[PDB]
Write a protein that binds this DNA or RNA. Structure first.
Ligand code: FES
Ligand code: MG
Ligand code: MG
Ligand code: MG
Ligand code: MG
Ligand code: MG
Ligand code: MG
Ligand code: MG
Ligand code: MG
Ligand code: MG
Ligand code: MG
Ligand code: MG
Ligand code: MG
Ligand code: MG
Ligand code: MG
Ligand code: MG
Lengths: 128, 96, 48, 122, 72, 137, 23, 74, 116, 85
RNA sequence: AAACUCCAGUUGACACAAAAUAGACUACGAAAGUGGCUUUAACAUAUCUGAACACACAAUAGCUAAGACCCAAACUGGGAUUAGAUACCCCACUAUGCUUAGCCCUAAACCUCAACAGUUAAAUCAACAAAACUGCUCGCCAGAACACUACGAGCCACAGCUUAAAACUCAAA
RNA sequence: AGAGGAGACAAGUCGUAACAUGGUAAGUGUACUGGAAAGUGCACUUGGACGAACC
């Protein structure tokens, strides 16, 4: 997970944010924000790590990365709420959707597909 | 062509849409004086939108604020607070 | 602009230094969230 | 996130109320919260009798603590307020000023529904 | 019609003219119609600002002796 | 001044009086009007019982208890006992929608007690306990 | 509609359950 | 009924015929029975009000269409 | 008036139905009859006063004359008031209009749930 | 736990107990308390409650529309202006 | 009538139960379902259809094990009614409804109206119902009854659930 | 081969469960119970009604 001191995605690109009070840095940190801000930071990190164009969100790679972040959040949620059938269904359906997206990406762009699999740690397995 | 023919345009005589009395104003559970305006003086029942006249959004906001105030110790449940009996009557209901 | 406003606000926050002074000031002061509404949509403040 | 703790304290003299408020704000800070303001709503008769810690309260002092706390501190603060004896009733909400009010153009009238039944003669 | 916006603004500002519509006379010119005619005349004179044109129309009608009592 | 249907509030200065007594001091007549019975208990403002009368205590039995006539007789008896104990004005608090909900009140008026206020205290749960199953008739 | 088919199925199921209980 | 009298007067003045009362069933499709075997039906029917008093088309419109009588109508 | 949009189960309505009427929500061209109010036993209080006085006076009419007269007057008033209530129902002043005249008015302007 | 002699209380005016009780009953009826008590005497199963609510909502819609039509047409109850034609 | 009179009425203390009014709102969810309050996490898919060969859910009822138990309540017992009353009516109480951990996997699970895209043009249209349709795809249906049955198979289910026939019979349903 | 089931044959017997608000609305799932149709509990359905201005 990103360190709690990490600033929010919106506030990390404002000038002079390093000259503000430590209290202000705490307020704009992931510590003082919900888990979805952490998910957005994770998504941004993964995009910068993997995709050729970090600013492109409609690409299949961006969709795969966002779905992977959602899947990780669902798994973390289910680890605590093991009797949440709705989120269990969301996790399974998201897994299937990511498998479909990976199949499409592998058929279209193989090198980028390998980069996705390596960066996100996805072991693409052919269905039986 | 012909100058006197009609022209397509928006309705200029269209009156502005009627606004609920609470439109644009923040409803807060601590504002027991405002919430008491929408409860029955005798039974504490929350009045329906046909009585209050509020829109759906403001009716839901008033309802949730009243429930929050009642459960958090700001507002009585079974009756309207007597301190607010003489507040402006904004509910379309008469008992007498 | 929001960051600047937050930096301005932080000065007035309650810390472990001015805790007792702020507590005494709060006890001395009163805050009223009560205001009624009229059929014409006008806010009526309490007579305080 | 930004939370507002609405606090109803037992009606006490000024030193006891000050000590209780200081204890509560110190607990909030210890759990990680940044307290921004403490607003006194005054002492008033409760809308209804409250039985807290084997004591029936008819009057209470109302305070608000606006603060910014991590999501994990809310549960701990709720437990702490439950354990406290000087607190008649404490509830932490999400700060109402956080939720911005979307502009409303006005009440859009609802026309009478049409074509619900076939126009065949009956 | 183009004049409909002028008529709506006139009704919103000065209200309905105390002069009564006589829908039996085909050549009846209501106070609103006189306002519209003066406004069109002034607009043809090169003026383009809507608020300034409305103000000049009101002032010209007042100077001619027309009673124009604003609703507020 | 103008008459107000709202009762005076304790802790507020009110000029209204009844035999020199404030609204907080007037005795209370509790009328439980069940579907088959009507019980009337007069108590002091300090919660001291003074009189009690039910349709059963008036010699009415079985279905005859749950009638307006029996409730009126019970009201007359309770009012007579309360007037013997020195009660003149009463605050009426009625709970239940039985046949004797109103007639019992009339009995009190026939007994010689003046009703200054009427209150409904019918127990209406906010979806608490579950009542018995519906009858098939 | 009437419930004649439902009644036939109801009687069949009731008799089957009773047969199962008996044996 | 606001113009029954005017229309009847106009029909009498122009020499033609008028019907401004309750149109009985069959005045056109059953004329040979109501009037006689030698009755002469109108060769043109003019509706100054095509709607009856319950805001439905006048039955005479359909009946004259059946009897092949051209109908002028406002 | 409550909204009907999206209430009934119809094609194109995605949500489950809100209302399940057993009759079509179409205005009829007639109103319900002037429903009578079920009569209640009257003069019960005066009867009770008279009977209690009888019990106290051993059913001696001479002592109870006043209460007996009151009960009789109440009974006569109740009978005359029932007759006057029948007369008023024939008059129809209490209601905005009698059901017959209202049915005539609705006949003049019938509902049109069909095309023509 | 609430204060007493505030909720559902009506002051009697000059001993007019009849009118005070009528006002109290009207208040309870308008607030719906009387119907709530009557329905809470015996348990109403959720399917039955939903059916009753649907029926009452349809009845309210129909009654309001019929009242609107009656009020709209009541002006036409005046005398016949074209009598004899 | 039986039953309770350690009962009833007021006042005070008082919950692992259920969530008036709002709601004349029509929202969330894939469906089942979800209408007390607060907080946390959270409501898949930047074409659509698609699994009965799988995976995950699935009201109420029910089983298993440990708890709670106000109230309700199958069964049972008593009272009444009745020709009888193994019911309707009244009273008492249990399984059960609740919590936790597993099962069971069924509903008039129906809005008996499949998903997606589109039309109101006409040749609109058996009847009723909730107007008639078009393109595409999947699932299902082929006289009634036998039959939510038998056998086979699968299942934590063992008086069960899913899939599911045939023979004899009729000219209907 | 003792038996069970279905259908036909159609009797007699015991009730009247369904069709009208069928006299306790009917039905689905499920559990228990009963000479028998069936009864009751729990949830669901309208393939019931609630009379359709106010009263
Ligand atoms: S009228 Fe503006 S929000 Fe309701
Ligand atoms: Mg069979
Ligand atoms: Mg699909
Ligand atoms: Mg299940
Ligand atoms: Mg139990
Ligand atoms: Mg019990
Ligand atoms: Mg029983
Ligand atoms: Mg619970
Ligand atoms: Mg369902
Ligand atoms: Mg089955
Ligand atoms: Mg089977
Ligand atoms: Mg087998
Ligand atoms: Mg029968
Ligand atoms: Mg029956
Ligand atoms: Mg049943
Ligand atoms: Mg039984």
């Amino acid at each position: 997970d990103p360190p709690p001191s990490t600033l929010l995605k919106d506030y990390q690109n404002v000038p002079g944010i390093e000259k503000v009070d430590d209290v202000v840095k705490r307020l704009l940190s992931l510590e003082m924000a919900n888990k979805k801000e952490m998910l957005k930071i994770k998504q941004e990190q993964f995009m910068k790590k993997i995709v050729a164009n970090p600013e492109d969100t409609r690409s299949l790679e961006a969709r795969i990365i966002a779905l992977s972040v959602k899947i990780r959040s669902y798994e973390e949620h289910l680890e605590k709420h093991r009797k949440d059938k709705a989120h269990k269904r969301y996790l399974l359906m998201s897994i299937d959707q990511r498998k479909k997206m990976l199949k499409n990406l592998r058929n279209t762009n193989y090198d980028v597909f390998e980069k996705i699999c390596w960066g996100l740690g996805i072991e693409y397995t052919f269905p039986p | 062509s012909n100058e006197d023919l009609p022209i397509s345009m928006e309705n200029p005589y269209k009156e502005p849409l009627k606004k609920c009395i609470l439109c644009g104003k923040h409803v807060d559970y601590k504002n027991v004086q405002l919430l008491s305006q929408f409860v029955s003086p005798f039974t504490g029942c929350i009045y329906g939108r046909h009585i209050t006249g509020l829109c759906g959004k403001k009716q839901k906001e008033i309802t949730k604020a009243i429930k929050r105030a009642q459960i958090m110790g700001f507002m009585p449940v079974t009756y309207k607070d007597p301190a607010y009996l003489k507040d402006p009557k904004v509910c379309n209901i008469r008992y007498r | 602009r929001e960051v600047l406003q937050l930096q301005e606000e932080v000065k007035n926050f309650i810390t472990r230094e001015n805790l007792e002074a702020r507590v005494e000031a709060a006890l001395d002061s009163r805050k009223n969230y009560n205001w009624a509404i009229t059929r014409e949509g006008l806010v009526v403040r309490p007579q305080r | 996130p930004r939370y507002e703790l609405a606090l109803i304290l037992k009606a006490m003299q000024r030193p006891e109320t000050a000590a209780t408020l200081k204890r509560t704000i110190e607990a909030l800070m210890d759990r990680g919260a940044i307290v921004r303001d403490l607003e006194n709503l005054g002492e008033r008769a409760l809308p209804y009798r409250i039985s807290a810690h084997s004591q029936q309260h008819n009057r209470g002092g109302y305070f608000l603590v606006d603060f910014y706390a991590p999501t994990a501190a809310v549960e701990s603060m709720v437990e702490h307020l439950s354990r406290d004896i000087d607190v008649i009733r404490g509830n932490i909400v999400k700060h109402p000023l956080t939720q911005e009010l979307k502009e409303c153009e006005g009440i859009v009238p609802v026309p009478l529904a049409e074509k619900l039944y076939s126009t065949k003669k009956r | 019609y183009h004049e409909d916006r002028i008529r709506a603004k006139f009704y919103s500002v000065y209200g309905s003219g105390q002069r009564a519509f006589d829908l039996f006379n085909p050549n009846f010119k209501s106070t609103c119609q006189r306002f519209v005619e003066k406004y069109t005349e002034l607009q043809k004179l090169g003026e383009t600002d809507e608020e300034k044109l409305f103000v000049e129309t009101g002032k010209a009608l007042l100077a001619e002796g027309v009673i124009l009592r604003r609703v507020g | 001044t103008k008459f107000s249907i709202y009762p005076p509030i304790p802790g507020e200065e009110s000029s209204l009086r009844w035999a020199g007594k404030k609204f907080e001091e007037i005795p209370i007549a509790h009328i439980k009007a069940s579907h088959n019975n009507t019980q009337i208990q007069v108590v002091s403002a300090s919660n001291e019982p003074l009189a009690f009368a039910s349709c059963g205590t008036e010699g009415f039995r079985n279905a005859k208890k749950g009638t307006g006539i029996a409730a009126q007789t019970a009201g007359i008896a309770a009012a007579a006992r309360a007037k013997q104990k020195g009660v003149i004005h009463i605050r009426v608090v009625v709970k239940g929608l039985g046949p004797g909900r109103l007639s019992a009140m009339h009995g009190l008026i026939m007994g010689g007690l003046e009703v200054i206020s009427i209150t409904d205290n019918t127990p209406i749960p906010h979806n608490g306990c579950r009542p018995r199953k519906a009858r098939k008739l | 509609k009437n419930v004649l088919k439902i009644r036939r199925r109801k009687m069949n199921h009731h008799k089957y359950r009773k047969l199962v209980k008996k044996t | 009924r606001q113009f029954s009298y005017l229309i009847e007067n106009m029909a009498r003045d122009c020499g033609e015929y008028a019907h401004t009362r309750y149109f009985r069933g069959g005045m056109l499709t059953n004329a040979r029975l109501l009037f006689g075997p030698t009755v002469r039906l109108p060769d043109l029917i003019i509706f100054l009000h095509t709607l009856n008093n319950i805001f439905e088309p006048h039955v005479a419109v359909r009946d004259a269409a059946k009897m092949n009588i051209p109908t002028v109508g406002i | 008036t409550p909204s009907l949009r999206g209430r009934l189960a119809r094609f194109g309505n995605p949500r489950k139905p809100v209302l399940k009427p057993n009759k079509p929500l179409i205005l009829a061209n007639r109103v319900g009859e002037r429903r009578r109010e079920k009569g209640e036993a009257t003069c019960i209080t005066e009867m009770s006063v008279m009977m209690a006085c009888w019990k106290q006076n051993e059913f001696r009419d001479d002592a109870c004359r006043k209460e007996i007269q009151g009960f009789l007057d109440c009974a006569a008033r109740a009978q005359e008031a029932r007759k006057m209530r029948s007369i008023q129902e024939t008059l129809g002043e209490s209601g905005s209009l009698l059901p017959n005249k209202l049915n005539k008015l609705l006949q003049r302007f019938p509902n049109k749930p069909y095309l023509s | 736990k609430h204060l007493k002699f505030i909720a559902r209380t009506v002051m009697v005016q000059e001993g007019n107990v009849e009118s005070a009780y009528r006002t109290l009953n009207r208040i309870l009826t308008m607030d719906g308390l009387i119907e709530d008590i009557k329905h809470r005497r015996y348990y109403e199963k959720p399917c039955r409650r939903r059916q009753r609510e649907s029926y009452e909502r349809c009845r309210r819609i129909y009654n309001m529309e019929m009242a609107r039509k009656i009020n709209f047409l009541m002006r036409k109850n005046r005398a016949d202006p074209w009598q004899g034609c």
